[PDB]
Ligand binder design. Structure first.
Ligand SMILES: *[C@]1(O)C(=O)Nc2c(C(=O)OC)cc(Br)cc21
Ligand SMILES: *[C@]1(O)C(=O)Nc2c(C(=O)OC)cc(Br)cc21
Lengths: 304, 304
């Protein structure tokens, strides 16, 4: 029993973190095989970030200008290239700690773990979700750029995020491991505002199923609803519209608890309309939306 | 910016997890140097757990009955001993991945990370606090026993908790790495109820300082209070009494924000008396008490 915001074990990713310095800018890099992946703004001075022309800035850079340090040992850079908003630094040594890995571009609503790093050294690990407005609500200070987001399937690490920026509103933006930003964000020190941060409806329902499995059942009511009726309520409360695909993915949780998905939708509907009334669900006074149905199943079964 | 429930990077502890089987009971062990630490109830059948005499049960056990597996390789057990509620299995091979470590018995209010494991394999990592009633609110399924709680200082892992039991109320009890239970709990399948779960006042104040540092300031009021007046309010709301030691530890946060500790106590006092009124602080609708003043400073500075 017990339900926690759990991150994947970080060891496999800790063994990939390196420090990358270019001129006077230092950030984190991800060392996989003989390549180090890092944000391309490593080549910028804070002054260049106001309006950078990365291709032009990169012309003035040679392999020897990119200092890559893994622990206290220096890696030799033998090639460099820009792929979208990331730099790929070919080093002469393959990372002996390279795990089995994939690069995946996740969809909003999907969750992942972040290994926050400073100077190639890990500080902590926490669980995030790609918000529907393509930002993440992380915890990143200066020096954290290049810290990565990932998921793990048995022994394979699927890297999904690389940290690049903090918007003026304290929220975070970044790319997948191909250098493509999630959302409309650009690696530039300019006014970039996020869109509406809607609640990930499928995740709240999954978390309500986790609450039932763990004993919290006060919110279960005698009602049911339809997808269209539920969605009218979800629109009013800035919740993502629920689709039949979302219903299908909640199937195993519905089967385990014996509570039909549309009945849980009705419970969620009353929670939105009436509030918690000072009560809690899994030690939270708000509806948690950063557990996918897959995360609930994983945590409630014991997948390692 | 951004403030998250962050766990320490788990790699150093992942390299210590092993599986321990005795008869038909399998749980997790912690392999440090040439010793494997595990709950002594590994020698029990679920039937023995109703009323075990561990010394008597242990007489029927030899070194060869304790099967220790690290990954897919078997460790040879050359000695075994019972220290309080833990078994120490001397193996013939020192763990090559042993980090620098200490065994510490933490006080209630202190936080730590848990690497939840199943069959010697890590599933996830999350941040806990030793509650004032000596329980932890974890996430543990059958097979999770022997999973450990720890803190990290640069390269030294201070192991503080080993998971042993789930009380009938869904809360968790366990020992330090010397086998001494936190609280009055015993490793027996019997009715054990927890005491009052009070709120860790010093941690809530530290979290309010983290909120101010990260932009959430609506709860700051024009009032102040005294330790005695604040404590009258804290008693009513089942909050731990605040001492001058707690005030001293909040000193760096007070210095950084320019908000005197007693002024923050007055803000907390009004939050207790009036509630949040539907508002949030660091994305929470309740007062978080699982960040120590040390955790707030660590996260807000970038300690690796
Ligand atoms: C990341 O590269 C990082 O590590 N720091 C940083 C800053 C910074 O330090 O600003 C003063 C700014 C940006 Br746009 C990105 C990053
Ligand atoms: C831990 O040793 C564990 O891993 N499982 C377990 C059980 C259990 O499986 O009960 C059916 C019970 C206890 Br008291 C402790 C533990």
């Amino acid at each position: 029993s017990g339900f926690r915001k759990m991150a994947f074990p970080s060891g496999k990713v800790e063994g990939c973190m390196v420090q990358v310095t270019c001129g006077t800018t230092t950030l984190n890099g991800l060392w996989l095989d003989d390549v180090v992946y890092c944000p391309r703004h490593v080549i910028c001075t804070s002054e260049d970030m106001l309006n950078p022309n990365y291709e032009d800035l990169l012309i003035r850079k040679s392999n020897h200008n990119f200092l890559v340090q893994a622990g206290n040992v220096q890696l030799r850079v033998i090639g460099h290239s820009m792929q979208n908003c990331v730099l790929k630094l070919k080093v002469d040594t393959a990372n002996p700690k390279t795990p089995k890995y994939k690069f995946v571009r996740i969809q909003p609503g999907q969750t992942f773990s972040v290994l926050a790093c400073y100077n190639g050294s890990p500080s902590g690990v926490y669980q995030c979700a790609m918000r529907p407005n393509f930002t993440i609500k992380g915890s990143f200070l200066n020096g954290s750029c290049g810290s990565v987001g990932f998921n793990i399937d048995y022994d394979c690490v699927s890297f999904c995020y690389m940290h690049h920026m903090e918007l003026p509103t304290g929220v975070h933006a970044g790319t997948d491991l191909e250098g493509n930003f999630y959302g409309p964000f650009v690696d530039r020190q300019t006014a970039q505002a996020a869109g509406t941060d809607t609640t990930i409806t499928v995740n709240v329902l999954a978390w309500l199923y986790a609450a039932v499995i763990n004993g919290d059942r006060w919110f279960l009511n005698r009602f049911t609803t339809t997808l269209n009726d539920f969605n009218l309520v979800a629109m009013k409360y800035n919740y993502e519209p629920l689709t039949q695909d979302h219903v299908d993915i909640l199937g195993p949780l519905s089967a385990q608890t014996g509570i039909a998905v549309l009945d849980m939708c009705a419970s969620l509907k009353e929670l939105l309309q009436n509030g918690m009334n000072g009560r809690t669900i899994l030690g939270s006074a708000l509806l948690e939306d950063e557990f996918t149905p897959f995360d609930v199943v994983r945590q409630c079964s014991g997948v390692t």
